[PDB]
């Protein structure tokens, strides 16, 4: 009985979800690496940042009036953009490998965003005073298809839960 | 004087009435303890919890 109490202590059930998400964060570092314990290759970086922006975007439809680490949310999004746009130039097979495993589009840069020879399907958006989350939400929805899927899923969920 | 265990987190009356609490329901400030100032601030926090507590 007392060993059962010890294993229910040492479980991840009891922890605060800061520590729970940190333990599954080194689970993800065990997943995405090229290697036994590589923690600084750029695939590790973008895996951490993509997962991080997913639990923070859940937290940030939950809390809207937060303002201090929303700067940090921008810092993750911009440094992730820097990391993909570097890694495409640097090691392309790792680039394609990661944004297939995570399932992300291409975000590289009177210009074209490196489309093919033929079949030049395109996606460009240019305008012809906002608050924060009313603009930071649809960008982060826009580049990432998993977040768009979560958006349409929770939209259908609320529309059939109110009905 | 700076024995950490039983003084660092502990809100009970004895240590604070000995060396941390002014007599008129008030506290002993930084100059009257001669203790490391961050540790003093955290135990001053503990004492000032204990002035919100049912004790003191």
């Amino acid at each position: 009985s007392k060993p059962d109490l010890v294993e229910k202590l040492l479980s991840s059930d009891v922890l605060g979800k800061g520590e729970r998400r940190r333990y599954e964060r080194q689970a993800l570092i065990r997943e995405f690496q090229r290697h036994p314990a590589d923690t600084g290759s750029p695939q590790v970086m973008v895996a951490v940042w993509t997962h991080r922006v997913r639990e923070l975007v859940k937290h940030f439809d939950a809390n809207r009036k937060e303002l201090r680490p929303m700067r940090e949310l921008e810092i993750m999004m911009n440094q992730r953009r820097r990391m993909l746009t570097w890694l495409r130039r640097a090691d392309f097979e790792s680039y394609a490998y990661v944004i297939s495993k995570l399932g992300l589009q291409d975000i590289y840069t009177x210009x074209x965003x490196x489309x093919x020879x033929x079949x030049x399907x395109x996606x460009x958006x240019x305008x012809x005073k906002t608050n924060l989350w009313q603009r930071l939400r649809p960008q982060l929805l826009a580049e990432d298809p998993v977040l768009a899927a979560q958006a349409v899923a929770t939209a259908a969920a609320e529309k059939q839960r109110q009905t | 004087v700076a024995e950490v265990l039983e003084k660092a987190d502990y809100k009970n009356v004895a240590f604070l009435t000995r060396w941390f609490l002014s007599p008129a329901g008030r506290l002993l400030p930084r100059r009257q303890t001669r203790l490391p100032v961050a540790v003093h601030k955290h135990v001053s926090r503990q004492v000032r919890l204990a002035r919100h507590m049912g004790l003191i």
Partner: protein, 147 residues
């Protein structure tokens, strides 16, 4: 002859090419870099965006298409999603297979040993390349040994 990056291929039998040409200004003794855009004929549409191409003057084909594509030097590698999933399969197969064959020797020890001996085999190889190129000599300079 220009060697400059493509930027547009949305365009029939014609690619828009940008070249970094540097103009002098006399006032400040500073070379200012501008980039001009040219329209150039290609024939095979093998130019994906990001390719480094060689354009040359030929007979004009239009009002503003004036060069012709000679050769694409460095190919721009492109995102194929199914091939990317194939690299996912091969890459985690390689990682799991290496960890299973390895897994006391914690796997870092075995891989770092393999990287040490791989670097040693490399250093022996380029050292013997230097040995066949030069002979027994101090690595002072190759400019000294060019005599």
């Amino acid at each position: 002859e220009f060697i400059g990056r493509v930027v547009s291929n949305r365009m029939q039998k014609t690619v828009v090419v940008a070249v970094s040409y540097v103009v002098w200004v006399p006032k400040y003794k500073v070379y200012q870099k501008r980039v001009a855009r040219h329209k150039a004929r290609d024939e095979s549409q093998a130019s994906v965006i990001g390719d480094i191409v060689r354009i040359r003057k030929s007979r004009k084909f239009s009002r503003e298409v004036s060069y012709s594509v000679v050769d694409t030097l460095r190919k721009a590698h492109v995102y194929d999603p199914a091939a990317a999933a194939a690299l996912v399969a091969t890459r985690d197969a390689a990682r799991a297979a290496a960890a299973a064959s390895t897994g006391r020797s914690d796997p870092w020890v075995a891989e770092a040993a393999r990287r040490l001996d791989a670097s040693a085999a490399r250093l022996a190889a380029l050292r013997e390349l230097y040995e066949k190129e030069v002979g027994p000599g101090v690595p002072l300079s190759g400019a000294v040994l060019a005599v």
